[PDB]
Amino acid sequence: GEIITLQAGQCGNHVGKFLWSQLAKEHAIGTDGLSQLPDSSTERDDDTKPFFRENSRNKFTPRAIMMDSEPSVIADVENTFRGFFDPRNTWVASDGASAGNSWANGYDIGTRNQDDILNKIDKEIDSTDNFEGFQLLHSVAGGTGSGLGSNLLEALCDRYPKKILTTYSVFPARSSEVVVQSYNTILALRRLIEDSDATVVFDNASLLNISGKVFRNPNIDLQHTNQLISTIISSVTNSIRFPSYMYSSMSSIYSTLIPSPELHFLSPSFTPFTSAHKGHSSYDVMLDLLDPSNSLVSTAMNNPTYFNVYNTIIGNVEPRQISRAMTKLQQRIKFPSWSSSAMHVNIGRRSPYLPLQPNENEVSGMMLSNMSTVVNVFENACNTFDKVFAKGAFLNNYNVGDLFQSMQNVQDEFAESREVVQSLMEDYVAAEQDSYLDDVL
Amino acid sequence: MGGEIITLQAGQCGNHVGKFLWSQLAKEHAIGTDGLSQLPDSSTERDDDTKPFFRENSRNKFTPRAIMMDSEPSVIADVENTFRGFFDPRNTWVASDGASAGNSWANGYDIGTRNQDDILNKIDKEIDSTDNFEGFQLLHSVAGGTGSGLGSNLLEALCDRYPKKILTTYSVFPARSSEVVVQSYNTILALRRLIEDSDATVVFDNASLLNISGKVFRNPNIDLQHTNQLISTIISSVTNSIRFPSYMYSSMSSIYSTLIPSPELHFLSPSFTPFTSDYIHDDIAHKGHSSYDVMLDLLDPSNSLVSTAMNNPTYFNVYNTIIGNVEPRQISRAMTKLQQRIKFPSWSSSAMHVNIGRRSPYLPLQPNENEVSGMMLSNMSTVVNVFENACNTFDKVFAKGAFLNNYNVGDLFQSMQNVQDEFAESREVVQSLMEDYVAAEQDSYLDDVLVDD
Amino acid sequence: MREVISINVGQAGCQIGNACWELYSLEHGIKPDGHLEDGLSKPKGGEEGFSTFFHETGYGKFVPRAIYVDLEPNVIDEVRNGPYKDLFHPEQLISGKEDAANNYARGHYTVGREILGDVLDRIRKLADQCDGLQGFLFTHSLGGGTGSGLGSLLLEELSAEYGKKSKLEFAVYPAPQVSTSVVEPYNTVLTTHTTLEHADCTFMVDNEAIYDMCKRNLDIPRPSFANLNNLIAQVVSSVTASLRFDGSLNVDLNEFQTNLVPYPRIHFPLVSYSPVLSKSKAFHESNSVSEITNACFEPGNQMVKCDPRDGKYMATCLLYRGDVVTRDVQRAVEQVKNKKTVQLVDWCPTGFKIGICYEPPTATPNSQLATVDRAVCMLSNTTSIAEAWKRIDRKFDLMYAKRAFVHWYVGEGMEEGEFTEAREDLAALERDYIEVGADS
Ligand SMILES: Nc1nc2c(ncn2[C@@H]2O[C@H](COP(=O)(O)OP(=O)(O)OP(=O)(O)O)[C@@H](O)[C@H]2O)c(=O)[nH]1
Ligand SMILES: Nc1nc2c(ncn2[C@@H]2O[C@H](COP(=O)(O)OP(=O)(O)OP(=O)(O)O)[C@@H](O)[C@H]2O)c(=O)[nH]1
């Protein structure tokens, strides 16, 4: 049941810092790690064991490991959270600052210093007994981050074949670095196709747009984006962190969301939230979640083919409004003729040890979906990669180790990545059709 | 079955470790530096037992049952001036021979044999002053030639002077021997006598000592005083079982019964958690470890005091002593976790041994993070590699016979051929020892008796 | 093993001794009055130091034990006019009315033995005054044949009298490029032969190398003999700091005798000192331990007109004066091992002796010195010493081929046989060093 957070790259470090601050504010842990709750009452309804290891000093150390080639962001996080994290759970590869935004250098550093990471994760696992899997937070655009993520994914799949792995990948926005970052993105995508079990996608452009819409200042900061990522991760993990009757593990969530390991990419949405009045009921929250103006990914589709959806509503809700919103969603959303029209609603309790968020008494809702927008994003990324590769031969100039010894193997690996992502999008557009399950029907 | 033990300080390093050990024992038993016990003589009730290590001349003064023997009187005078009235001036041996004329084991053995009558007379006087006795504890400090020679002479005298007493020795090995030839020669010549007469020997490689001193301490520079303080604390922890008598191990003989499977295998490897009685011991309440984590740290190679070089290490006798408020369920959990991680020989089904001691009621109580400490002693053939370093040095230098003009003087042999033959004999002895170790590492060692019955 | 008897022979040797005593007085802040200077220094006065070189009397006045032997009255009057004579004893200093010869012909003659007897009984009385003995220190120049011969005679007499303590002989080697006197290589070879006969440890220091050092490092326009004397004083003080003052890792003279002699016949170590630079370079920035360890191996600091890169590495020592971290110098020596500047051997390479002393270096007002809290003096054993030997031996061979002056030497106190013996022994030493170095 215990999940270990893996913060890869400076993006991973930022999102981990934000998520741990949010979880401390929720479970009354603070920055010092000591239990901010009185020692007179031990009855608690939350679950901090899979995320926080409680020591004899009653301090809750976050079960997180930071793997990054840039020690500056790790030192900044340690300075901001002095007394929170464990110095033994810090890994900077002892190679200095980062150098090169390609996947090759990241994977080479991972393969070189895999022994230290393996020892760290083995110690973290042996510290407890009940284990379920790991949690990875990285960006597919960052070269070193993607390399470290691929290395740790390979290590996990060839060491612990029984632990389900979930990751959160934030795709880059429409910018200049996509001529080279697309290589790292498609390599991470191939690694996810090969070994990953669950992945939650994010689009940087859509995230920036949503943050600029919900915020007053249009100058959206990367810290604000990381705060939004922390909020969505807390909303999707509330069901595990506060288990009451139905949901007590991510296993059931991924069972009801992911139908097959070939389709293990999920698009999140969450509305409404701040980062002070109530104006949206549960029906309003559900229709806003359905509307593309509240999703954390770029839809770019008039009517996406919804395969599996699951929503968690936070707040005091009425079954009548729940049924009305469910009927409206069933009437609006179209489901394929081969897959069932399953719609799951989980009522997540609020944390009494968490300070009151702005816009009090406003019911909110998160929704994880599997539709044909992630495939549009993947198609855009693969088209950009194909264009830049077939037009300019510049990727053979920035490589390390085996990728630098010969550039032919690099082109072969990239062609294999393109082939596997093409097979993925073909399987997705086939599952979009009703003739997908015709082999048994 | 518990008897008194007399401390034998030899050489500069030996005298430093002895002074540090006696200061630590005084701090533990509330004795102090002035010699007079800081505790009043009215509260006679004492849970510890200083009698095996301290002579009770008066009711408020505990004179340590120790004898210092060295050629450099400067360190002895410094120790005596620092500890006013603590040590016994009659137990200080200098022979008025001046500074050591080199760092040769030959000169060491010569200066030992010349004044062997004085040290034996002092030992006899201490034996007449005491009433009970069990054995001696010698500090070789084999890194120094004169100290190693003095220790070898002391051992060669004690073996045939008191055969009814068990002899334990502590040999401090350097990290990177400066003069490889001289240091290897001295270590091999001392190891010869260790194999011949010594009953138990504990090695202390300075590499892990410097590593721990750079890790747990804040100052990057390492000083020899707080370096020897580590061995001081180790000797204090291993003698705690007799100072504060536990309920399982209460005598050095009973401890060595399970620590030594055979007199041929009398070399151990120590390991200790981050210390709490050293100078910089403030960074210990941030770990928050239990007894299971203490056992894990003891079994970890980063906390050992000798060169681990763990390449499938063969264990023969593993023993651990935990001091503090220890939990039996946590001990059982640690034993279950260690029996599936420690390699054990298929011929002997003997597992690791656990002992629980008592903490001093006058020592500064540590917080619940590091209130309980642990020590581990394991019979591993990894010291064979530390010895093979010196054996390879001997094999690569003995081709020409360098430094033969230094070991020819002092000893009973002045010719080159006799010294060469003695060095070859000592090399053959240590080679046969390493062969015995690599044979005991296999299962045929116990089959040597099964093949003929 | 505490007292060291130092002897100053010849004009250059007496000047070097004056400079070394002046530097010893400056390090401890010793003035001519003293009583130690004063009797509250701790440890600039008793106990050690000064008790290794300065004999202690009843009144507490430290007496620098030095035997100023010379046959030129000018140098004797010069050393007597200063306060050094008040520091010394009139019987310890020997006076000579007429110089022996030009220069070694009469330096080893019976006139040498007439003073040998006197200085021998004087040394016996001085050893009776003090307690214990560590070694014999010698300070004379090979350029001066009279001083070199008298030093060789003192060395032979001390070896034949006691032979218990090792004899240290600091030999000042002339410039291999230019020779002021025509008899200079002959006396140099004869003195090297006498040292091979009766010396357990020698020292090779070139004057041209010191001149190039003070011209390049110290940046002085007019080098003088006083600067060379002060640099030699700094060298000797860096060697004997561990005996004068205490440190974290104190070393003994027996450790030096063992380290510098890794073979039956190896007693020729080179000296280097770092950092030596101008005062402006030290005022601008400060160097690290790695820079000092790299400069220790430079050809300039070797104090010899030869390149140590072509030489082969043997057992070397490094003494560190001042606050010095052990891990820092360990990392530095590991970096030097990784660089592989000097070619190593199969026996010595793991022989980097590391000694530490708490006494920081002192900058004399006459000669500029880099004011650094950590100084390093390295006693190396390289095979470029054999190259300098072969150069001076080819010079001596061409000379002895012509030599223009054989009749004077064969008539006064020598013969062609002694010259041939010295030449053959020097060549044998050179080839033996080459073969024992290149045997790896
Ligand atoms: N949203 C968000 N993304 C970030 C943040 N920091 C880094 N990133 C990601 O990092 C990418 C840029 O590359 P880099 O920052 O150099 O990451 P990298 O290539 O792995 O190099 P290092 O981070 O130094 O290891 C962007 O595309 C982002 O996706 C952040 O604070 N917020
Ligand atoms: N780590 C450590 N080593 C020491 C210490 N004291 C002496 N040594 C060892 O001693 C060696 C130096 O020689 P000395 O200390 O003079 O030993 P010795 O030559 O036998 O002289 P004596 O000990 O007086 O008989 C070094 O190589 C050290 O390994 C100490 O306090 N700490």
PDB file of N, CA, C and O in Angstrom, chain A residues 55-57 88 122 126 129, chain B residues 286-287 292 337 341 368-369:
ATOM      1  N   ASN A  55       8.451   8.536  12.756  1.00  0.00           N
ATOM      2  CA  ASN A  55       9.563   8.060  13.564  1.00  0.00           C
ATOM      3  C   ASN A  55       9.190   8.081  15.047  1.00  0.00           C
ATOM      4  O   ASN A  55       8.051   8.363  15.424  1.00  0.00           O
ATOM      5  N   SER A  56      10.168   7.772  15.902  1.00  0.00           N
ATOM      6  CA  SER A  56       9.921   7.773  17.342  1.00  0.00           C
ATOM      7  C   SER A  56       9.658   9.177  17.867  1.00  0.00           C
ATOM      8  O   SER A  56       8.950   9.342  18.866  1.00  0.00           O
ATOM      9  N   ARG A  57      10.214  10.195  17.214  1.00  0.00           N
ATOM     10  CA  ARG A  57       9.981  11.600  17.547  1.00  0.00           C
ATOM     11  C   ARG A  57       8.622  12.107  17.046  1.00  0.00           C
ATOM     12  O   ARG A  57       8.349  13.316  17.097  1.00  0.00           O
ATOM     13  N   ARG A  88      19.431  11.385   3.637  1.00  0.00           N
ATOM     14  CA  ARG A  88      19.812  10.116   3.031  1.00  0.00           C
ATOM     15  C   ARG A  88      18.971   9.786   1.805  1.00  0.00           C
ATOM     16  O   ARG A  88      19.410   8.989   0.967  1.00  0.00           O
ATOM     17  N   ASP A 122      16.033   0.174  -2.200  1.00  0.00           N
ATOM     18  CA  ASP A 122      15.989  -1.057  -1.420  1.00  0.00           C
ATOM     19  C   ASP A 122      15.878  -0.761   0.068  1.00  0.00           C
ATOM     20  O   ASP A 122      15.106  -1.413   0.781  1.00  0.00           O
ATOM     21  N   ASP A 126      12.755  -1.815   2.412  1.00  0.00           N
ATOM     22  CA  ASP A 126      12.975  -2.640   3.595  1.00  0.00           C
ATOM     23  C   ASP A 126      12.626  -1.914   4.888  1.00  0.00           C
ATOM     24  O   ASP A 126      12.436  -2.570   5.918  1.00  0.00           O
ATOM     25  N   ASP A 129       7.015  -2.953   5.352  1.00  0.00           N
ATOM     26  CA  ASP A 129       6.640  -4.259   4.820  1.00  0.00           C
ATOM     27  C   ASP A 129       5.596  -4.167   3.718  1.00  0.00           C
ATOM     28  O   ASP A 129       5.794  -4.733   2.636  1.00  0.00           O
TER      29      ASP A 129
ATOM     30  N   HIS B 286      19.342  13.122  15.183  1.00  0.00           N
ATOM     31  CA  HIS B 286      18.671  13.342  13.910  1.00  0.00           C
ATOM     32  C   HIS B 286      18.472  12.062  13.110  1.00  0.00           C
ATOM     33  O   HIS B 286      17.828  12.105  12.056  1.00  0.00           O
ATOM     34  N   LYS B 287      19.004  10.935  13.579  1.00  0.00           N
ATOM     35  CA  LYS B 287      18.848   9.662  12.887  1.00  0.00           C
ATOM     36  C   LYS B 287      17.599   8.912  13.334  1.00  0.00           C
ATOM     37  O   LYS B 287      16.860   8.386  12.493  1.00  0.00           O
ATOM     38  N   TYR B 292      16.728  -2.552  15.610  1.00  0.00           N
ATOM     39  CA  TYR B 292      16.872  -3.180  14.302  1.00  0.00           C
ATOM     40  C   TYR B 292      17.775  -2.355  13.395  1.00  0.00           C
ATOM     41  O   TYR B 292      18.644  -2.901  12.703  1.00  0.00           O
ATOM     42  N   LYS B 337      15.680 -10.814  10.281  1.00  0.00           N
ATOM     43  CA  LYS B 337      16.104 -10.104   9.079  1.00  0.00           C
ATOM     44  C   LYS B 337      17.567 -10.373   8.747  1.00  0.00           C
ATOM     45  O   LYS B 337      17.947 -10.339   7.570  1.00  0.00           O
ATOM     46  N   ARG B 341      20.116 -12.570   5.489  1.00  0.00           N
ATOM     47  CA  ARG B 341      21.006 -11.671   4.769  1.00  0.00           C
ATOM     48  C   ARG B 341      22.483 -11.926   5.034  1.00  0.00           C
ATOM     49  O   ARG B 341      23.314 -11.512   4.217  1.00  0.00           O
ATOM     50  N   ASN B 368      15.698   9.656  22.915  1.00  0.00           N
ATOM     51  CA  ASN B 368      15.151   8.389  22.437  1.00  0.00           C
ATOM     52  C   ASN B 368      15.582   8.070  21.009  1.00  0.00           C
ATOM     53  O   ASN B 368      15.221   7.018  20.470  1.00  0.00           O
ATOM     54  N   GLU B 369      16.351   8.964  20.388  1.00  0.00           N
ATOM     55  CA  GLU B 369      16.828   8.720  19.031  1.00  0.00           C
ATOM     56  C   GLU B 369      18.071   7.838  19.030  1.00  0.00           C
ATOM     57  O   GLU B 369      18.175   6.901  18.230  1.00  0.00           O
TER      58      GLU B 369
END
